[PDB]
Amino acid sequence: WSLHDSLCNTSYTAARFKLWSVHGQKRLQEFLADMGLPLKQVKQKFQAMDISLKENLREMIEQSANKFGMKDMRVQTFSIHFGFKHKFLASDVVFATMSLMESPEKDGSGTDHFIQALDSLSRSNLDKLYHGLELAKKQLRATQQTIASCLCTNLVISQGPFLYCSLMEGTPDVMLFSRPASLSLLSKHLLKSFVCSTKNRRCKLLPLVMAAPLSMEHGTVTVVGIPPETDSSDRKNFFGRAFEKAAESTSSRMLHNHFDLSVIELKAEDRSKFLDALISLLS
């Protein structure tokens, strides 16, 4: 990507900078101006940027991010070189594989994408990787256009002990997140943007629960549950028990099909019957 389209889409600077509200979009402008990066080089692809700028980029960015309240900006990873022009960071292979396996447009059984993603890990197939990097882009530009919806419309309900949200089919690019695996990441980025956005002190420490429609014919939705967010969250989720006991109490129709327990398919009509009993159960 370009250096500009990757600041507007990392769900760690798209939260701090609040790159969904015109009032704080100028923060990005000021951050760029404080480094001497022309607004015409920052918009161009990174491999074509001038050679005189990129000398100490990875330091003049870490510095000028202290002046804005972003001190965790350098991480520890690895990188690989094959030949003349082949240079990958270990978190590009991941975002490309993770999006070859979860492409929205389906072309057969459930095990047709799995094969194409297993293929793109050997060096003899650099034409799939280099292709699975155009899906991973298309996805990341169609996530900040949803977290921009549920935060310029306030669709995060404070239903008591946990937040709550839901989606609408009419919004564009909402059939992409229909899969019950590519929905956890959207929710986990939604929580990160929210906790940074809201002014309360209670909502900033409540776990989120999200539902989006799965099947129009069966009339069912998919539901997840993510731990209370923070900087040092232990990451020990607890919804696999809550949803189980709630469907047990209401005695509705549920499916714990996956391997992780915190993802369920639920009849569109048992939504409230389930949710109220869950509210009471978690208490």
Partner 1 sequence: EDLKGHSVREWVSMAGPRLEIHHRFKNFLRTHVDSHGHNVFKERISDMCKENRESLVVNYEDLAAREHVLAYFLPEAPAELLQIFDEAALEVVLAMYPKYDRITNHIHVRISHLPLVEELRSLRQLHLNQLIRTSGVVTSCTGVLPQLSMVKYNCNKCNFVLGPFCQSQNQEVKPGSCPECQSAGPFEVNMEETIYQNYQRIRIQESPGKVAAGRLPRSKDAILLADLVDSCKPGDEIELTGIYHNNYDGSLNTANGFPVFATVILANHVAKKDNKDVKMITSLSKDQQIGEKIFASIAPSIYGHEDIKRGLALALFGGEPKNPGGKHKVRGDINVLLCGDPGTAKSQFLKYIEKVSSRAIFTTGQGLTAYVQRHPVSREWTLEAGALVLADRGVCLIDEFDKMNDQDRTSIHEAMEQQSISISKAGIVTSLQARCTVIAAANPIGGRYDPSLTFSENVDLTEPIISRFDILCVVRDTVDPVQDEMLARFVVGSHVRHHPSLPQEVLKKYIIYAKERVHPKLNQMDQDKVAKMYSDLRKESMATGSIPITVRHIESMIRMAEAHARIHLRDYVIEDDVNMAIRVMLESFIDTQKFSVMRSMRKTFARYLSF
Given the rule CB under 8 A, which residues bind partner 1?
A: 26, 29-30, 32-39, 53, 60, 170
Q: Which residue has the tokens 């996530």?
A: 143
Take residue 46 and report the two structure tokens written for it: 């990174």
Residue 98's contacts (CB-CB under 8 Å, 6 or more residues apart) are 136
CB 270 within 8 A of CB 253: yes
Closer Cβ to partner 1, 34 or 119, answer by number: 34
**CA pair distance 267, 92, nearest whole angstrom:** 37
Closest approach of partner 1 to the CB of residue 30, in Å: 5
Closer residue to partner 1, CB minimum distance, 30 or 112: 30
CA distance linking residue 66 with residue 225, whole number of Å: 33
**What whole-number distance in Å separates Cα of residue 115 and Cα of residue 99?**
13
- Provide, rounded to whole angstroms, the least separation between the CB of residue 21 and partner 1: 14
- Closer CB to partner 1, residue 38 or residue 160? 38
Closer to partner 1 at the Cβ: 34 or 270? 34
Q: What are phi and psi of 193, to 5 degrees?
A: -70, -40
Q: Which is nearer to partner 1, 66 or 251 (CB)?
A: 66
For the CB of residue 38, give the shortest distance to partner 1 in the complex, in Å. Answer: 6
Given a contact cutoff of 8 angstroms between Cβ atoms, the answer to whether 149 and 155 are in contact is yes
Would you call 165 helix, strand, or coil by DSSP?
strand
Provide, rounded to whole angstroms, the least separation between the CB of residue 167 and partner 1. 17
Minimal distance in Å, beta carbon 70 to partner 1? Answer: 17
Q: Give the burial class of 66: count Cβ atoms within 10 A of its Cβ; 0-12 exposed, 13-18 middle, 19 or more buried.
A: exposed
Q: Minimum CB separation from partner 1 for residue 55, in Å?
A: 12
When the beta carbons of 100 and 150 are compared against partner 1, the nearer one is: 150
Least Cβ distance, residue 29 to partner 1 (angstroms): 3
- The CA-atom distances, in angstroms, between 14 and each of 55, 85, 185 are 25, 30, 15
**Least separation, in Å, of the C-beta of 34 and partner 1?**
6
Residue closer to partner 1 (CB basis): 83 or 170: 170
- Shorter beta-carbon distance to partner 1: residue 25 or 91: 25
- Concatenated DSSP letters for 8-49? TTSTTHHHHTTTTSHHHHHHHHHHHHTTT--TTTTTSBGGGS
